[PDB]
Every structure is written in structure tokens, then in C-alpha cells.
Amino acid sequence: FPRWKRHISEQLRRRDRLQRQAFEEIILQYNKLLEKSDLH
Amino acid sequence: DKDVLRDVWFGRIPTCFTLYQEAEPYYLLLPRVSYLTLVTDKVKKHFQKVMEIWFEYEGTPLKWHYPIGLLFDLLASSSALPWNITVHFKSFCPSKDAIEAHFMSCMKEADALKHKSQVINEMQKKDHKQLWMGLQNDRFDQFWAINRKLMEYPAEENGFRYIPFRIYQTTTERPFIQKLFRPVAADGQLHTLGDLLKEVCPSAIKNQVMIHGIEPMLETPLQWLSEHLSYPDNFLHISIIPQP
């Protein structure tokens, strides 16, 4: 793989690490909580 | 290569939806490759301890017909996460049929740009429906089963006839830029992102050139970018953003 393709792949994995993976569980958990709060 | 396709396809943006000036904020991971009206049904649902909903980021209305990933890239990527979006109410959101029609018009423009003979128009309504459903139900396999053929070019040609791209500068409030641009130079070598910018938008070369939330090297061949970092509408949506 040429330098530029290596670059794109690295940057997309990094991107996912920062954006999707960081937030998935906490957003799911928060929504569980939100749904549990809606029961009053 | 195939992993880049998937990584692009599965991109998510963490997003906080807050009601405009009691409603808790609502958090959601948005698909970068989709459209707001498609994926925000539950946001509309949720903001109804109230007695026609629209979205805005830092004063800018977020338009239904742009991909979510582009909107974020251009408007909010300079800011910290989650994307802070403000939810607004009208006293009186296009149809799914309206979105599907926009999407397909975009694919058709991209097709007419890429091929001497229109591949999309040689397909059956079946295949078009599978393209849309593929996008709508977040199914990479079903979508790319058809999208494959849209990414073919005859082997002897070294690339598409013209690359389908749109360049965005700073805000969606300024029209995007388009013009005919071939993937291969006269000499026969492959055109780069750098070459595209140099031609179509010389002032981007201080600035950030962002595609799907990352910054490719300018030396990246444009043909490959087209095949790999296009959105599902088969366009390269490119942001030019002020640093940082």
C-alpha cells in the first residue's frame, strides 16, 4: 500500500475511535435511562 | 480497499439534540452517509412533551438534502463533540419519497458524469429500489450489490469519464462548486485531489480539505477517491474549512 492509502485507512480508524467507539455505550446507557425516566 | 468502503459506510457522528430556548437533551449516533429526516424520527418523537420539526447548528439551518457527514464536517468539525444541534418547532421534513427522489437524481447526475452510456438507466426499477432501501435500512451488502456496477468503468479507460464531486466552502449557505474534471491527465497519469483543487478551487491550497471527516493527502489519486470515498449518492462531497 502507497503512503496515501495507508494514510486514509489510519485516519479513518482513528476517526472511528474518537467518534463512534468513544460514544456508543454511553449513548445507549443514557437512552436506557431516558426511557426509565419517562415512566413516572 | 473494501475495508475503506465499509469504514466510510459505517461512519457515525455523536450528536446532542437540545430543544431551542421540561425536555432533556437527546443523544444519537448519526450515520454520516445518510440524511437527517431519515434517521431522526425518534428525536421528533422524544421532543413531545409539547402541545414540522427543523434542525439548526450555531445559527445555520441544517438542510434536508445534504448528507449528515458533510454538514458536520463543514459546520461543526472544528468544535468538540458531541455535535450540538438545536431542535426547533413549526406550527404547521420531506417525504421518504421526496428524499428517495433527491437521492436518485443525484445518482443519475453522477452516472451521466461517469459513463458514456448510462448504467443506471440500463438497470431495472428493482435495482433502483434496492439502492434506496440499501441506503435507508443501513445495509452495506444490499446497496453495494448494485452500487458495484455504478463503480465500473471499462478496463481500457483507467477511470471514469468525469469525476462526480462537489466542493463546499465554509458554509452550506454558499453554493457548492462543480465542473467537468477527468480522472486522467493528457500525459496519461492519474489526477490527484491536489490537481482537482488547483483547477476548480485554487484558494484551498491555512485551509483544511476534509472528506468523510479525515484529511487525505493532496497527492491522493482522484479516481480512487471517487471509487472509495464517495457518499452513497456517488458524489465526492468535499469540505474546505478554515484552520483549525
Side-chain angles (χ1 to χ4, degrees), chain A residues 2-35 37-40, chain B residues 1 3-21 23-44 46-49 51-89 91-92 94-115 117-124 126-128 130-148 150-244:
Chain A
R3 185 174 63 249
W4 56 263
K5 192 182 299 179
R6 190 220 48 231
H7 181 74
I8 282 172
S9 295
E10 276 153 2
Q11 285 307 306
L12 279 175
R13 294 193 219 102
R14 174 184 182 269
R15 180 203 73 168
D16 295 342
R17 186 177 207 76
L18 295 186
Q19 296 178 351
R20 193 182 55 232
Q21 296 166 14
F23 288 85
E24 250 161 20
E25 306 97 310
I26 190 171
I27 293 183
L28 261 23
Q29 290 303 333
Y30 176 87
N31 258 304
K32 273 171 57 191
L33 261 52
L34 188 51
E35 252 100 283
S37 185
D38 281 355
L39 297 191
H40 35 269
Chain B
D1 268 13
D3 278 332
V4 167
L5 296 193
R6 291 194 72 92
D7 282 352
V8 166
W9 177 271
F10 286 110
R12 290 294 184 283
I13 293 155
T15 302
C16 178
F17 291 99
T18 279
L19 198 49
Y20 172 64
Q21 67 183 30
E24 302 96 337
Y26 188 101
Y27 287 87
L28 188 57
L29 288 167
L30 302 177
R32 306 185 76 118
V33 304
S34 198
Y35 305 86
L36 278 169
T37 2
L38 230 51
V39 308
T40 53
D41 237 351
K42 285 185 295 304
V43 176
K44 182 188 168 183
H46 167 83
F47 284 123
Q48 278 174 355
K49 188 188 66 178
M51 88 164 196
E52 66 278 355
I53 187 204
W54 62 280
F55 306 108
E56 158 251 318
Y57 174 77
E58 272 186 359
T60 300
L62 300 175
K63 291 303 155 63
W64 66 269
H65 51 277
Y66 299 117
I68 293 168
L70 175 82
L71 293 173
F72 173 76
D73 272 5
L74 186 59
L75 302 171
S77 73
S78 70
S79 300
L81 294 171
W83 188 9
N84 280 112
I85 291 181
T86 307
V87 183
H88 289 262
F89 274 133
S91 277
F92 303 91
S95 93
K96 293 178 82 291
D97 296 36
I99 309 277
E100 179 179 13
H102 170 63
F103 182 70
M104 293 303 305
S105 73
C106 288
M107 298 208 74
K108 287 167 185 208
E109 186 179 346
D111 186 69
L113 283 165
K114 286 178 294 181
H115 312 109
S117 62
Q118 295 181 326
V119 178
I120 190 81
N121 284 57
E122 287 181 350
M123 278 176 186
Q124 305 185 314
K126 182 181 187 289
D127 295 337
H128 298 171
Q130 165 155 334
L131 283 172
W132 173 245
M133 290 311 168
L135 172 74
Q136 167 177 352
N137 295 329
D138 194 10
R139 298 293 310 198
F140 176 106
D141 47 337
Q142 302 239 76
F143 176 85
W144 273 95
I146 311 308
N147 197 52
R148 267 169 235 299
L150 299 170
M151 297 297 180
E152 283 171 348
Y153 52 84
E156 61 273 16
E157 298 279 9
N158 300 333
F160 302 139
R161 201 166 165 69
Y162 300 106
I163 300 306
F165 72 95
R166 290 168 181 183
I167 293 166
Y168 299 81
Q169 286 168 288
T170 298
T171 176
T172 41
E173 294 292 291
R174 291 169 60 172
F176 60 74
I177 284 170
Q178 298 211 240
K179 84 181 195 188
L180 297 197
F181 194 79
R182 297 178 183 277
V184 286
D187 15 285
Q189 191 55 66
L190 291 197
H191 274 143
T192 62
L193 181 56
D195 295 327
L196 173 68
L197 293 188
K198 265 177 280 143
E199 166 86 20
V200 175
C201 183
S203 68
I205 302 114
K206 183 188 77 103
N207 282 119
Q208 221 173 353
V209 184
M210 187 168 295
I211 311 171
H212 286 291
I214 69 177
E215 294 172 61
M217 300 177 61
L218 294 188
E219 73 179 58
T220 310
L222 188 63
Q223 174 64 32
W224 183 94
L225 268 179
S226 183
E227 296 170 14
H228 292 90
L229 259 62
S230 284
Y231 287 75
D233 66 8
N234 279 221
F235 269 97
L236 277 167
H237 295 258
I238 304 181
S239 294
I240 320 291
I241 309 155
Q243 270 274 356

